[PDB]
Symmetry: C2
Subunit: 188 residues, 2 copies
């Protein structure tokens, strides 16, 4: 399904969405402005992404997909599940902390995305869960996927506290370390 | 004092009435003050912003749920915690617009409302921590409760947006509880 022309259009649309959110945050991300920056027809934009929530959640899914594909796992080749999980948690954290305004825009879209964006939210959730489950495992068990979901929930809550300046990066790291210990502490 | 407690009550009652009608967007400072029959200044003294107002309203909801144990003595820590989760789930599901208003304020509350957010988090964590204990909980139980509160918030957001059914939410919290305490 699809074409090289469609993949090229989608890449430009998401690049434009991220460029606009990096400069002016969630509020700056508007359909007309994104269409103009990506050099795509507004109608074509609406067809692939029916709203700014769809654009931002799709940009977030692409970002997690890139982190997953590009993270060098040789660094923890001889590490324990506890170390591998803390490594991936640390990698996702540093990636989100790099551009606060952009992270804030994608997170806002993700937290309040409606049912019409279920496929885009599921792609995000499955990617983060897969990264944590594979770190704890290789091919994970159903229990490792259930643990991964809990860690993702703790990660999201702490990301929200960090974005709003209610928690420091230090506070976030300590809270995530505690959750990992409570779930798999005996795996080190 | 008496008059102060009555003024805060009227302010929070007006907030809830407005939120129940039109959600987060309907809640505005002037409208709340007029409905509560308080001066805008009295409103700002206790609640510096609409975010402080909605997060404080959320704290009163949790406090009232907490106020309303003897019936669950015979049950195990696992069963008491699942019962507490069920009560909190049902309470938030009864009035979607009111829940949406309080959740939106809680999620995006800034550093200036940190005190109110911290108090709300302590209230929900204590409800879960107390459910797993007999008497005062241990630090380990409060840490477990914080993880349960994070799972609960994530599932509440999925439920509010029609991405998870009430059954889905129940099953996910059951799984998290099982993973943490057994």
């Amino acid at each position: 399904l699809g074409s090289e022309a469609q993949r090229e259009r989608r890449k430009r649309i998401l690049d434009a969405t991220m460029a606009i959110a990096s400069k002016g945050g969630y509020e700056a991300v508007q359909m007309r402005a994104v269409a103009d920056r990506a050099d795509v027809a507004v109608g074509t934009l609406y067809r692939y992404f029916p709203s700014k929530v769809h654009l931002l959640v799709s940009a977030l899914g692409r970002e997690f997909s890139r982190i997953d594909a590009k993270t060098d796992r040789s660094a923890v080749a001889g590490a324990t599940p506890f170390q591998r999980l803390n490594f991936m948690v640390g990698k996702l954290n540093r990636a989100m902390q790099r551009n606060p305004l952009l992270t804030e825009a994608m997170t806002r879209a993700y937290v309040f995305a409606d049912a019409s964006a279920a496929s885009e939210v599921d792609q995000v959730e499955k990617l983060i869960d897969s990264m944590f489950a594979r770190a704890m495992a290789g091919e994970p068990t159903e229990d490792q996927y259930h643990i991964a979901r809990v860690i993702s929930d703790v990660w999201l809550s702490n990301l929200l506290a960090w974005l709003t300046r209610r928690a420091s990066a230090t506070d976030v790291s300590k809270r995530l370390d505690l959750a990992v210990r409570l779930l798999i502490g005996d795996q080190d």
